[PDB]
Chain length 312, copies 3
Amino acid sequence: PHMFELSDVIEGKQFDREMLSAIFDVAREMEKIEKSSSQSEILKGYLMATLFYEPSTRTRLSFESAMKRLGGEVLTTENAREFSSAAKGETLEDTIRTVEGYSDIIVMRHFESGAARKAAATANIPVINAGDGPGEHPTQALLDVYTIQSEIGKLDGISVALVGDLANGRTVRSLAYLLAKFKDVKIYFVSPEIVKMKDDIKDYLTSSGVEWEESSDLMEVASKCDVVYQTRIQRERFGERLDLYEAARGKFIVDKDLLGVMQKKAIIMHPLPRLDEITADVDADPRAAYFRQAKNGLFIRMALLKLLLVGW
Amino acid sequence: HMFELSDVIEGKQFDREMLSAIFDVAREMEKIEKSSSQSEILKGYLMATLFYEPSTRTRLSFESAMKRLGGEVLTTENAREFSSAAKGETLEDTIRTVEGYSDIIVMRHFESGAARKAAATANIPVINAGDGPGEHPTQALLDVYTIQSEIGKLDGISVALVGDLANGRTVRSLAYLLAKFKDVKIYFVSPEIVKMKDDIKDYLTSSGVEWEESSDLMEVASKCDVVYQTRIQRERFGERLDLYEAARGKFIVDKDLLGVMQKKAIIMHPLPRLDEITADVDADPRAAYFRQAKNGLFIRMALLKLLLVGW
Amino acid sequence: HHSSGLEVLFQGPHMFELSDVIEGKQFDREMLSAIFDVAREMEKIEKSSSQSEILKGYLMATLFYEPSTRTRLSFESAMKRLGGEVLTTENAREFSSAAKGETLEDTIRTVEGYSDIIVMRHFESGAARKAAATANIPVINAGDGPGEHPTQALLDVYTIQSEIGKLDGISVALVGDLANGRTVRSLAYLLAKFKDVKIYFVSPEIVKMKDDIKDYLTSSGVEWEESSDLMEVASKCDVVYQTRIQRERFGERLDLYEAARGKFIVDKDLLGVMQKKAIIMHPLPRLDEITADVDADPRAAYFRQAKNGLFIRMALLKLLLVGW
């Protein structure tokens, strides 16, 4: 019995290997609570205020479900830009000092990088970053690592393929950041050259002693990975280079043929939403883990709510 | 025992025995709502709403229903704007995502056919809250329940369906369920150009339901247990503004219409109304449309109860 | 047990009528004393670890036709802190069937079938009274478009009593757009129910307080003074109650705009001339009319004011639904 060492959940760098492992154990105890017939009272009497400045399905509803499955209540604000007094020019710091009067924990998806950290510094209650505009989405990174552990049974000694828009991809960057905390990890960067991973993550993995390789050949890489983590490449990333778009057409898709070359114990992940970059006929394969991944978000967010409000 | 329906999607799922049994559950839900004790029947269950179109009655009655039973609700309104359906996510993906967080899904989509796709996809129950311009089965249930409740029986009744019959999803759906009862008579009251389509006419004929068409709401209304009013949108007359003008003032529920009605008849309207029912009708005890909305709460309590914990 | 120093001689219900919360003139001294006493009991419930069940089994319906942060969330928090439930409707203009032309009376007679209390912020003055007259359940006015915001008036007076320790004998500066200031007019109205109150109207002449409120204060024997000099007035006030002046109010008179520039701002210079036991209030939201560096001063009471809104709204919910 003791206080959680984090006062807020804002950024990947707040987490070390031991913290990640301990949180993942709590997520397994939350999975047992969620499966139970009887209503948990762990967070009875606690109120969570949401502040969604951008749209969300998975993050907004998993946090609300997590709070209610633990017996807590929720005060929602979506389109804090239309329906909140943030539509009358109110600063973030004012919104936070107002809303903490009514609540015990704040969950915020802002439109501007740095918003979540300013919120945490201003508030005298815990803040969770639910996505920080072009910034960090740390509970996405936590549930992604948890899903790998849950599906593969290990984080040490794995090969992970990060596919799609790696240059501008916040989830692939954050997943690489956290995976670098385990041993004997290999990461494959699979992308068109035009959206390859930025030097900052490459140099970070090297300095962490994580082996990495760059490829434009998903079929080859997929055959020797434990995990294929898929993300969208937006057409607009090719700018006027429609020659380069044509060359990438059909080369970074998860389809039945790609599952054909993958190992029987490997998995397909996607933070979601997806468009055509994973074909609907892949969903029937037991190795398609993206819906299980979204459900693990419920257990990870239950664990963080429980830890921030009542401790270990 | 287990409810015989896995989902509530379309009126054709219902036989008259199932309707009568649901109405008995709705009366048990009315006693629960009236009690001063918080029900715990649905304690621990979570309902996710998905509203892709605006709603007052349907949205708030489902949420009230769940909470009056001690359940909780995860709401999504304008799933077009504030959901990740605002970034092109397919219905099947939304449903497989949302079912990870909830025990029952209530959905008002913008496209006919969405609710049955959601039911087929989900491993939890789905209730159709309005399938865009298609099935709105809980409206049809609360409509038939309101008639049973106000009139005291469904066999042997006389119902006027008034307004846009050609295009009227709600009046067509109410005709579909009333024809499961015996010795029913239906009056179709409308401008001739928006008369009831031939499919519903043949359906009533085959069902052994007597029907009559009329443009004379004063003569019909004197002979009916129920006047079920709906609005005729100007759009339905298209370029026929002459037929619009000829209908003006002729399909209104007002004090003069109530004056020719039997003392135990009722006015119903799915709502919202504009001027097709005058405000001064509201004070008449026969004005049943606010009681009808409240009956939605008891019907929706009954369906949530039945789908989640059974009879 | 009387906040006025004397012992409470009788235990039992009060003598007032309270079935809706619509307008300031409902709030006689007996009712203000009761609401403030219940608000102090709610501060203890809110502090406590155990979940209150005072309003278990009650359902609130909200109808917000205008944007809100403090009023919408404080009502919902208030209901849930007392173990009640909430059915929300924000954007009742876009996401409700009032997007399809429905009358307010039809909305109220619909929603009352699903709920035990309605909290409404409409866009038209007079909506809250029409909703109360229509409904057979309690209605609370959460802001009646350009009309009254009575729960703000309540929490403002309660905040003054809490921060200063009295209402009789205080000096209050009402600052900003007084001519069109819903909250300053309602605050002036409730303060006139107490003894030896002094009010300072601080503003540009162009947005000075209307004669109806001046005449009311004169009739009620409340001393008042007009000023365009916030630095002079702030030094002799218990309370500086700040509000925004919209540039739009100067019309074509940009000479008058220029002349008011930086004259009606609460900043560290103004705090400098203020008494140690004085306070800054603002109903919120603010923009530039209170500088961020004022927030660290312990006299900056506008976030404590907003919190007091929770305790007031908990008190009203209890008084309306379960009574004495």
